[PDB]
């Protein structure tokens, strides 16, 4: 069974429980091992959202438009 | 002509409080740009839209 406690997820296993942390590295496996039609069959997407990909591997950064400076004329940004 | 009525005639201070039109009159037509957005920028002061 699962519990949100803060940012990570814990799960019981049962006579007197077993609590463990659910490893991201973990999780992320087990839904890369998910089936096509078992994406589909839970709101998902084969080409443009599969779940394994809420997980996040590797981080876009927006480019300065999107968090642009201000400068106070030179030495002041 | 006189006027065919007659009116109510007489004195009654009044105050003159702030708030004068060109304290308010305000036009653009293109103008400085916020920076983020790139929309035009707000208040009269600073030429905005």
Same mark, same amino acid.
């Given at each position: 069974?699962?519990?949100?406690?803060?940012?990570?997820?814990?799960?019981?296993?049962?006579?007197?429980?077993?609590?463990?942390?659910?490893?991201?590295?973990? @999780? *992320?496996?087990?839904?890369?091992?998910?089936?096509?039609?078992?994406?589909? /069959?839970?709101? +998902? &997407? #084969?080409?443009?959202?599969?779940?394994?990909?809420? @997980? *996040?591997?590797?981080?876009?950064?927006?480019?300065?438009?999107?968090?642009? /400076?201000?400068? +106070? &004329? #030179?030495?002041?940004? | 002509?006189?006027?065919?009525?007659?009116?109510?005639?007489?004195?009654?201070?009044?105050?003159?409080?702030?708030?004068?039109?060109?304290?308010?009159?305000?036009?653009?037509?293109?103008?400085?740009?916020?920076?983020?957005?790139?929309?035009?920028?707000?208040?009269?002061?600073?030429?905005?839209?």
């Amino acid at each position: 069974t699962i519990r949100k406690d803060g940012l990570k997820l814990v799960g019981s296993w049962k006579d007197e429980p077993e609590l463990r942390v659910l490893s991201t590295e973990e @999780i *992320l496996n087990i839904f890369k091992h998910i089936s096509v039609k078992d994406f589909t /069959s839970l709101g +998902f &997407n #084969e080409v443009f959202s599969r779940p394994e990909w809420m @997980i *996040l591997t590797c981080l876009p950064v927006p480019p300065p438009p999107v968090r642009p /400076s201000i400068s +106070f &004329n #030179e030495s002041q940004r | 002509k006189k006027l065919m009525a007659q009116i109510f005639f007489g004195p009654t201070y009044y105050q003159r409080l702030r708030h004068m039109v060109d304290d308010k009159i305000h036009a653009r037509a293109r103008g400085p740009m916020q920076v983020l957005t790139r929309q035009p920028v707000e208040g009269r002061s600073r030429d905005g839209g």
